[PDB]
Amino acid sequence: QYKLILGETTTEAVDAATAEKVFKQYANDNGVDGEWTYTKTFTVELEVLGPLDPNSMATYEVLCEVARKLGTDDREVVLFLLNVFIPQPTLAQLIGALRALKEEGRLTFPLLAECLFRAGRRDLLRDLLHLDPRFLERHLAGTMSYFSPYQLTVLHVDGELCARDIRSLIFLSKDTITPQTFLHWVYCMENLDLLGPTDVDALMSMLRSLSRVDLQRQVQTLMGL
Amino acid sequence: QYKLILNAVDAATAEKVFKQYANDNGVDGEWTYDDATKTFTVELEVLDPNSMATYEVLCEVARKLGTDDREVVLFLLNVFIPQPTLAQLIGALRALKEEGRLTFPLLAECLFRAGRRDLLRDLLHLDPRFLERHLAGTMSYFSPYQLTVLHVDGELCARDIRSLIFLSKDTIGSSTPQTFLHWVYCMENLDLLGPTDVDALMSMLRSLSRVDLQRQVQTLM
Amino acid sequence: LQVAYHXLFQXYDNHIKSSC
Amino acid sequence: LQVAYHXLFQXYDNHIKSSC
């Protein structure tokens, strides 16, 4: 057990020198670079890329409160739409991935709004993001989407497919496997390179073999010639 | 008197001046002021070492530049002041560096074109024999017009530039030019000379009997 | 403030959309 | 160090020249 004062961060080290190395790395990781004083505690005076720090930490509240109130299947939608997708994630997996995107600048507020909109969480737009979904639906009408037509197609198919069809989908997927959801099946096929934004033939092959010809035709309408 | 430790009519104005001086420099720490000693002290920074230690090179370069080389450097670095002083040049160079316009490789070519190969070897630690070879197979930081005016400036003599001022009296304007680069600046402001039209430069060189220099401008552009 | 919040969101969204 | 200083200068010059 070793303590760090900036933000009371703690670690478990074999010796004091290792604890200093771990903490000195955490200093760069955050961006803070102050004078070090090492009892079993270490204190850090300067920063780069108080007020600013409070704002940065406060911004995370929006993402933390959003992720905690997201829920099982919405987690997949959000992670799928934000490229880096994890199959059947947990709070610790999602919170970590969303924070890894925010620190990489890949996540923005208007993107997060459309991300929560496509998820169907208009309740979270109203209550947490303070954005009226009646206005947001009008905003997206005359604005180019942050997500690919393929991304939006897979999301639409996911919504129309029922619990029985997705159970049958897993049974048919055993020929290329295992997935627990349709978005999990998509991820497996994307990794195996059978599905993708360019082809989408594999999605229609499954929908034809699930008797959802209406969904197969919907994918064809959403992709064209 | 009001002091500022880094880490006026009244105290309120003195605080406003220092608070703005911190943001201008980029610094933003905790403020502690004493009403008896008349001093204010300043944590964080977001704008430090070389962004401060680099200026030492620029200061030593500007102080050892000298009268006519000051004009060459300021002309080549766009913002030119006629017959500048150390306080004018040091201020203009530090303003360019803070604006991000001034770079080390630009400053090297700037000092090279000036003819200060001595300052490249001594202060910039760059061998001019290597720099002249580097500039052979590399696109210049300065315009062909910028380099032409600089070449003409070198070939024009003390008597020709005296006669140039006498001929410039038809477009002046008292203040009158004191050098050829000052005459160029006056014509650039009056919009008779420029990178697109160098007809005015050739008109002066024809009326100074330097037809060789007039032909050189024609050969250059 | 609400209409201004919706305005600000549109301004920020249009700004990232007017980049790439 | 001298040849390396001349090398580093060329690298930095080529970097700003490759931007625009």
Author numbering:
A (entry chain B): 2 to 7, 14 to 45, 49 to 54, 56 to 60, 63 to 69, 101 to 221, 226 to 273
B (entry chain A): 2 to 8, 20 to 54, 56 to 60, 66 to 69, 101 to 223, 225 to 271
C (entry chain R), D (entry chain S): 230 to 249
Source paper text:
One such protein is KSHV vFLIP (ks-vFLIP), a cellular FLIP homologue that targets the canonical and alternative NF-κB transcriptional pathways, rendering them constitutively active. The core IKK complex consists of the kinase subunits IKKα and IKKβ together with the essential modulatory element IKKγ (also referred to as NEMO), which is the target for ks-vFLIP. By means of a physical interaction with IKKγ, ks-vFLIP is able to “lock” the IKK kinase complex into a persistently phosphorylated state via a mechanism that appears to be independent of known upstream cellular activators, such as Traf2, Traf3, Traf6, LUBAC, Tak-1, and HOIL-1 (17), and is thus distinct to those resulting from stimulation by endogenous proinflammatory cytokines or cellular FLIP variants. Pivotal to complex formation are amino acids within the region of IKKγ spanning residues 230 to 248 (a dimeric coiled-coil) that are accommodated within two clefts of a ks-vFLIP monomer.
Inspection of the ks-vFLIP–IKKγ structure identified Q236 and E240 as potential sites on IKKγ for an i, i + 4 staple given that they are nonessential. Based on these findings, the modified peptide (spIKKγ) was subsequently synthesized with an added C-terminal cysteine to permit future conjugation to cell transporter molecules or fluorophores. To address this, we cocrystallized ks-vFLIP with spIKKγ. The overall configuration of the ks-vFLIP–spIKKγ complex revealed a heterotetrameric arrangement analogous to that observed in the ks-vFLIP-IKKγ(150–272) structure, where both peptides contacted clefts 1 and 2. As indicated by our modeling studies, the ks-vFLIP–spIKKγ binding interface mediated by cleft 1 showed a high degree of structural similarity to the original ks-vFLIP–IKKγ(150–272) crystal structure. Crucially, the H235, F238, E242, and K246 quartet, central to binding and subsequent NF-κB activation, form similar contacts with the cleft 1 region in the peptide complex. Also in common with the ks-vFLIP–IKKγ(150–272) heterotetramer, there were few specific interactions between spIKKγ and cleft 2. Notably, however, the aliphatic staples replacing the side chain moieties of Q236 and E240 (though only partially ordered) pack alongside the aromatic side chain of F53 located within the interface between clefts 1 and 2, where they form van Der Waals interactions. Our crystal structure of ks-vFLIP bound to spIKKγ reveals that its mode of interaction directly mimics that of IKKγ in the original complex to the extent of forming a heterotetrameric ks-vFLIP–spIKKγ assembly with conserved interactions in the spIKKγ-spIKKγ interface. In keeping with a high affinity, the apparent dissociation constant (Kd) of the vFLIP-IKKγ interaction in the presence of peptide increased approximately 80-fold, from 380 nM to 30 μM. This corresponds to a Ki of 257 nM and is thus comparable to that of IKKγ(150–272).
